[PDB]
Design a protein around this ligand. Structure first.
Ligand code: ZN
Lengths: 359, 15, 361, 10
């Protein structure tokens, strides 16, 4: 048609219309803008998450498999909003990367230099925006995550994904095979338990969580985790600030210690978004080599709203440090009381000295 | 959807 | 000083600096003075590339902006810099004003990006200079961070920038080159019938006067290398096919060659056919190894000095190998032994090869 | 430049 972008000639197109187009003998149109909704925190508007993408795939496959559409091209569309166009376009690209094995340059060629352009994605915090990520960033981050084995659509369970996102069931997401991000539990007397707390305790007990890291002030008694054999560690810093690199080195060493035992780490701040994304984001860059923008895009594709405000520029300015540490640090051979007997990252020179007897 | 999927792969282009 | 409220107008400094985009010609008032440079300062497209504006454009914008700011009749007015309404002309004007704030007024990236974030309609992202359909974009955020990082590492210095020299030597008839950093020149291949033509003479004169000690040729032969060797400059071929990406073996030889010359205080001049794609692959790899640019920052800084560098699939190649280049500081060393493949300079080699050299010696 | 206007971030 007119304002449509071709993805596959004669069979898949992306359109934008402020009216409902009529299906013809050669074309069938569909939209999900009125049925699959992004739940904004403040002025963030997307991208759509992995559960939204699963729901889109079910709908898209039903249209493709319908015999009535056997000789038609399918046109996926949104309204003309630059934000709603960005969401539709990014979701269709994530579909092709994850379900059809396309590569980044293949899904990005249809979108390049479109006029009017797509709105870049902004953060979920309460200050004016000053940092953006693009569809190219999100596509490269989701592709790299899939290549590294961190996204497994074959096992994805939509029912579980959507259940545990709810506040009354604990407001958490499993991000990777090693990490959970969650909101802080709360109880009436931190110095029986409510439904979201019992839900978290049961899931963690059954899914090999071995360490909980708390980044915000105390709203619950840590004994409830230690009662069932889960280690608890405070690495607390102020809401809305960026952590000193000494806190990041402590966190990465503790996480590596647990991962080498085969366990998972669950990380919360107040909401499990800003502070938590600083620390899990640094470890993902250290381990897998994401760019800062890719890391933010992949995190938000699983758990919307992660990495808030000045934390975005902070991750961007320190990404080289996190990757350098694979060569310039080791896990300490001596415990630090600061991480409850776990081992922080230390310099090569300090590690060499620890293998000798200080005379 | 993610199981038992239509074929929409990117067309092969030459080396 | 009061805030100004006007459609399609963005505040940079309250009551004093605004960025407008209009499809009409605005009228000056007792409180406002407006200016556009679109008729005087313009980008020359290779194909469908349209920006960003380069360092010479920025310098000329700064002269005009200062003349208007310093005019006595404007002492109590807000200055509104504007473009037309196209999303490409808007991106060029916004990016140039940000580069001005970074290089002349010491602003940082998050300070210059806040007025531009989430503007509707959005700015058009920047594309490459090649013939294939675009498939890779860089943003105002990428360009601002690349220019800022280059300034912090000492690679841009507007206080010493020579506009007349910059504009002269970009022209084909004087050699089609730019000095990119204190260590590197990028240029188009010379040509001859082996009696030298004006642009070859222009190149040989400038290289003799500006401490070039190595020339690296990346394209098929269009001239006799003896002209460089006769004035004492080492000449080295590292040729690879037009429009391709170089094998990492070539990149490691290039980086070691460059390190060897830089250690002596000399400059390296690199050419392919146009001095854009193949040359951008090798100089870009060295800049990421040395200074830690992201791939998108590196492409943005290179095009700010020399429009059109890094073409087509070379953009995705630089993007995918940026961690390799940066981390060669830890996974390679400069060889203890000279190599005939680079004319007796010292190549980059693996830690293990370096260990076994020491063991033998 | 000799007369750079004072436009530093506040
Ligand atoms: Zn000759």
């Amino acid at each position: 048609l007119d304002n449509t972008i071709e993805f596959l000639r004669g069979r898949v197109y992306l359109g934008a219309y402020d009216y409902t187009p009529e299906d013809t003998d050669e074309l069938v149109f569909f939209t999900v803008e009125d049925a699959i909704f992004y739940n904004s925190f403040h002025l963030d508007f997307g991208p759509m998450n992995i559960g939204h993408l699963y729901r889109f795939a079910v709908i898209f496959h039903e249209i493709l498999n319908d015999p009535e559409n056997a000789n038609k091209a399918v046109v996926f569309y949104s309204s003309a909003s630059t934000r709603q166009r960005a969401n539709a376009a990014c979701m269709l690209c994530c579909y092709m990367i994850l379900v059809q094995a396309w590569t980044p340059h293949q899904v990005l060629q249809p979108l390049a230099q479109v006029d009017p352009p797509f709105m870049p994605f902004r953060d979920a915090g309460y200050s004016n925006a000053d940092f953006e990520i693009t569809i190219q960033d999100v596509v490269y981050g989701v592709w790299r995550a899939k290549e590294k084995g961190l996204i497994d659509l074959h096992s994805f369970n939509l029912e579980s994904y959507e259940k545990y996102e709810h506040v009354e069931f604990g407001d958490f997401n499993v991000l990777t095979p090693d990490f959970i991000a969650f909101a802080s539990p709360q109880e009436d007397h931190p110095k029986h338990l409510n439904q979201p707390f019992k839900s978290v305790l049961n899931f963690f007990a059954n899914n090999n969580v071995q360490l909980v890291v708390r980044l915000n002030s105390h709203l619950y008694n840590k004994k409830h985790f230690e009662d069932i054999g889960i280690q608890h560690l405070d690495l607390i810093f102020e809401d809305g600030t960026c952590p000193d690199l000494s806190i990041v080195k402590n966190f990465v060493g503790a996480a590596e210690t647990i991962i080498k035992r085969g366990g998972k780490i669950a990380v919360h701040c107040k909401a499990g978004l800003g502070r938590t994304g600083c620390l899990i984001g640094a470890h993902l860059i250290y381990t897998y080599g994401f760019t800062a923008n890719e890391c933010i895009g992949f995190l938000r594709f699983i758990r919307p709203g992660m990495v808030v405000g000045p934390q975005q520029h902070w991750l961007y300015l320190h990404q080289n440090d996190f990757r350098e540490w694979k060569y310039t640090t080791r896990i300490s051979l001596k415990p630090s009381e600061a991480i409850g007997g776990l081992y922080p990252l230390i310099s090569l020179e300090e590690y060499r000295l620890q293998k000798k007897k200080l005379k | 959807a993610f199981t038992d999927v239509p074929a929409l792969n990117y067309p092969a282009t030459p080396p």
